Amino acid sequence: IIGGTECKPHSRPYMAYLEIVTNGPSKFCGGFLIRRNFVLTAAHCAGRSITVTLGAHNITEEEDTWQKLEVIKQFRHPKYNTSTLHHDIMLLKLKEKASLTLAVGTLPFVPPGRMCRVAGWGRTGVLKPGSDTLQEVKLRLMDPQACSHFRDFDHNLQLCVGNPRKTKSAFKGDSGGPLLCAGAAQGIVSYGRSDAKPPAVFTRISHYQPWINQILQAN
Numbered sequence: 001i002i003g004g005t006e007c008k009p010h011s012r013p014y015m016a017y018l019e020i021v022t023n024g025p026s027k028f029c030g031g032f033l034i035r036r037n038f039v040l041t042a043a044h045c046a047g048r049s050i051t052v053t054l055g056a057h058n059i060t061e062e063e064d065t066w067q068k069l070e071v072i073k074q075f076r077h078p079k080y081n082t083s084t085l086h087h088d089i090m091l092l093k094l095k096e097k098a099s100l101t102l103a104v105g106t107l108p109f110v111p112p113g114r115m116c117r118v119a120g121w122g123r124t125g126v127l128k129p130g131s132d133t134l135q136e137v138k139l140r141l142m143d144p145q146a147c148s149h150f151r152d153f154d155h156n157l158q159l160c161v162g163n164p165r166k167t168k169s170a171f172k173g174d175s176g177g178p179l180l181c182a183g184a185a186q187g188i189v190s191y192g193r194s195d196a197k198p199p200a201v202f203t204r205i206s207h208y209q210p211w212i213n214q215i216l217q218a219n
């Protein structure tokens, strides 16, 4: 998260920190708990295996709120496209149902000009390392023409997010985190420019609701 502030610890109890294993070292993403055994995230966060940590704030400092949970199966959207980046969404089924605590719970599951918030442990600058702590930033929902320069951007599939006159943005490591507008998840962090100049492109959750529901029922 670039240009954001540190969250009050545990104030976003649905947030998930993902460590993804592959021919290379671990990579990291965000995500969010939508059922006690399901986490929503981005398709580009798929790997050979994934571990989810719930209840975290400072991810380097173990505490009783932590629940480190095995993922049994990844459900990457079958149409996720590495060329166009369309359909960047994935469900992770946890081995067991998470415990509900003050620090861990599910997330109950908009015109441009509206302000939305996104949280994550990703880089706090283009050349800065990932954050030890959960950060959040408020971003402006933009008209789709604001994202025209992303040539494969599609208004039906995606949200255009972030005033270009502000430096505020999600970035590397924030992939998969929710964008909330009035407390409801509307987007998922997907991609943007390598120099972090806003706006960026988020998956429009509403388009994928039938696919999500279908997975939640077959599994």
Ligand SMILES: *[C@@H]1O[C@H](CO)[C@@H](O)[C@H](O)[C@H]1NC(C)=O
Binding pocket: 058, 059, 060, 061, 132, 133
């Ligand atoms: C997070 O925890 C580590 C280890 O306890 C500590 O070194 C670091 O300063 C902490 N970061 C913040 C911002 O609290």
Ligand SMILES: O=C1Cc2ccc(Br)cc2N1
Binding pocket: 169, 170, 171, 172, 173, 174, 175, 189, 190, 191, 192, 193, 194, 195, 196, 200, 201
């Ligand atoms: O919003 C985002 C998420 C993201 C991930 C990676 C890169 Br490079 C840029 C961005 N911008």
Ligand SMILES: [Zn+2]
Binding pocket: 009, 010, 057, 063, 065
């Ligand atoms: Zn704590």
